[PDB]
Each structure stands twice: as structure tokens, then as C-alpha cells.
Design a protein around this ligand. Structure first.
Ligand SMILES: Nc1ncnc2c1ncn2[C@@H]1O[C@H](COP(=O)(O)OP(=O)(O)O)[C@@H](O)[C@H]1O
Ligand SMILES: O=C(CN1CCCC1)Nc1ccc(F)cc1
Ligand SMILES: O=C(CN1CCCC1)Nc1ccc(F)cc1
Ligand code: NA
Length: 267
């Protein structure tokens, strides 16, 4: 399906510099048109996100579409395998759905036939002006095998690191998830953040989902019992039980590999 996503910048904890950079990348062409005309600036054709799984790459792509009130089309890397015309088709449909964000997920899979699924993607990108109002986003968990051809001027304009959340970002992720939830006053999310070093955004969200269901299931059984004979909160003891089912999904060794890649870039 194609639609304007409902996720916003507010649903995304941490990454405040990245969000700043992205909002400008898409707000300046429409907020400062005369300056873009005066100096010969062209809008960006897209960006490439890299980092460990479950830390916000997909969320940021949907939030860019929501900011621009644009349709969102998601394409999974391994699904381009059945046929070089499939890269042709998907760009046609993005063009038809403009203004549109076209998101290529799981691109590390293509980087390992597949050699000109790539060549067709690079072809479709060069033959699409920015006046077509399609914004391309790719994401990968394997930055070491990126073909630098995709980052040349005229294709994806910047490579952006989305890291595991630090302690402050873990508090923000928890708060954004629970933004519209009835959390008990005995709940200390800053202590929860301190006990989840190494957790991804997805790992933290699973704790929140488990704790919400425990409170709902408890509410069901309490009312069943009272009928023999006031919104209920998610309490500290629901989070205590939910943390029993929790552990990181990204190993210490992969984390070292991401940090080396980004530090050597001076990024
Ligand atoms: N920065 C974040 N803020 C809030 N929730 C997050 C964040 N990162 C991940 N999540 C949670 O984990 C899920 C998966 O994140 P996603 O962006 O799909 O990861 P990926 O980086 O692999 O694209 C999100 O739907 C959300 O529930
Ligand atoms: O992440 C892996 C390997 N993982 C193991 C389980 C799934 C894939 N390698 C890697 C990570 C970051 C980097 F910059 C270079 C290489
Ligand atoms: O870190 C680098 C260096 N490059 C320099 C310019 C950009 C980064 N490579 C690398 C990192 C992890 C890994 F698993 C394999 C290779
Ligand atoms: Na990922």
C-alpha cells in the first residue's frame, strides 16, 4: 500500500542532530525558495543510512515523508530476486505517486545477476531529475561493503550513521514509546535506561510492549473476578516482569565494527 506515514519526529528518541540535519534537507527548498534560486542550489536526491538493526533507520524514512506530506513506498532488498525491468517498474510507481519517498531496505543483502539490479538502480537514479519530487532513501547494516558509486554527486547525497542509543537516548526512546500510555508514578525510566546498556531501540520497545500487555491481561482478570462479587496504569512491577524476557540483539563484536567504521570516517 502507498500512503502518508503517521510516524513523526516526536516518535523517535535520540538522534537530535540527525533529525535537525534531515528537517533542513527537506524544509529549506520550500521555506527559503528565493535563496535557493539566487545561489543555484538544487534539492537533494536522497540519503543512505547505516547502522545496527533496530535503531531508527526505517522510522526516520517514514518521518521524512510525514514532514513532506508525501507517499511512502518500501522495497525490501531480497525481494528484487525472482527481471531487470523490476527496477524500472518500482521507479515508475514512485514517479506516479509523487511527492514520494522511495525507501530501499535491506540493501546489504544485494551487496552480497545482482550486479545489474545495482546497475539498473544507478541507471534509474541518473535519469530522474529532482523536479520529479521523488526522494530516495537506502538503509544498510553492512557499511563496509557499500559500493561508493551510489554516493557520487547526483545520487545519494550523504551517508549518515544511526548508532545504538546512549544512556540519554535510551530515556528518550522509552519516553517516546510511552508518550500516550498511562504510566504509574512509581516508574523510573532513567533507572531503566541505566540497566539497558547495549540495548537497541527495538529491544527497549519490546520491554514497553510486554509491560503494557501484562497490565491489560491483569485488568481482564481483575474484572472477571469482581463480577463474581478509572484507567488502569502500567506499574513498576509490570516493567520488573517484562525485563526478565529482555536481552540485547546486537553483539559486542558487531558494535565494535560499526564504531571503527564511523570513527575512522571521523564521523
Ligand atoms: N530511535 C528510536 N526511537 C523510538 N523507537 C525506536 C527507535 N529505534 C527503534 N525503535 C523501535 O524499534 C522498531 C524498529 O526500528 P527500525 O527503525 O525499523 O529499525 P532499523 O534501523 O532496522 O530500520 C521501531 O518501530 C520502534 O518501535
Ligand atoms: O554485523 C556484522 C555481522 N553480523 C552478524 C550477525 C549478522 C551480521 N558485520 C559488520 C558490522 C558492522 C560493520 F561496520 C562491518 C561488518
Ligand atoms: O572501518 C573501516 C575504515 N573505513 C575508512 C573509511 C570508512 C571506514 N573499515 C571496516 C570497519 C569494520 C569492518 F568490519 C570492516 C571494515
Ligand atoms: Na538495520
Amino acid at each position: 500500500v502507498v500512503e502518508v506515514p503517521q510516524v513523526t519526529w516526536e516518535d523517535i528518541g535520540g538522534l537530535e542532530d540527525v533529525k535537525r540535519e534531515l528537517q533542513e534537507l527537506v524544509q529549506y527548498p520550500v521555506e527559503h525558495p528565493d535563496k535557493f534560486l539566487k545561489f543555484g542550489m538544487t534539492p537533494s536526491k536522497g540519503v543512505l543510512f547505516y547502522g545496527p538493526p533496530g535503531c531508527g533507520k526505517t522510522l526516520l524514512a517514514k518521518a521524512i515523508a510525514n514532514e513532506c506530506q508525501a507517499n511512502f513506498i518500501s522495497i525490501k532488498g531480497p525481494e528484487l530476486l525472482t527481471s531487470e525491468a523490476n527496477v524500472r517498474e518500482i521507479f515508475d510507481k514512485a514517479r506516479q505517486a509523487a511527492p514520494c519517498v522511495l525507501f530501499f531496505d535491506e540493501l546489504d543483502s544485494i551487496a552480497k545477476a545482482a550486479d545489474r539490479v545495482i546497475n539498473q538502480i544507478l541507471t534509474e537514479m541518473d535519469g530522474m531529475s529532482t523536479k520529479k519530487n521523488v526522494f530516495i532513501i537506502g538503509a544498510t547494516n553492512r557499511p563496509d561493503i557499500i559500493d561508493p558509486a551510489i554516493l557520487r554527486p547526483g545520487r545519494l547525497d550523504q551517508l549518515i550513521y544511526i548508532p545504538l542509543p546512549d544512556e540519554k537516548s535510551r530515556v528518550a526512546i522509552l519516553k517516546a514509546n510511552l508518550r500516550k500510555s498511562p504510566v504509574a508514578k512509581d516508574v523510573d525510566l532513567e533507572f531503566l535506561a541505566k540497566m539497558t546498556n547495549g540495548f537497541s531501540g527495538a529491544d527497549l520497545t519490546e520491554i514497553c510492549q510486554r509491560a503494557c500487555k501484562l497490565a491489560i491481561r491483569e485488568s481482564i482478570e481483575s474484572e472477571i473476578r469482581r463480577e463474581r462479587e478509572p484507567v488502569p496504569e502500567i506499574r513498576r512491577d509490570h516493567f520488573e516482569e517484562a525485563m526478565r524476557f529482555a536481552r540485547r540483539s546486537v553483539s559486542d563484536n558487531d558494535i565494535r565494527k560499526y564504531e571503527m567504521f564511523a570513527q575512522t570516517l571521523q564521523q
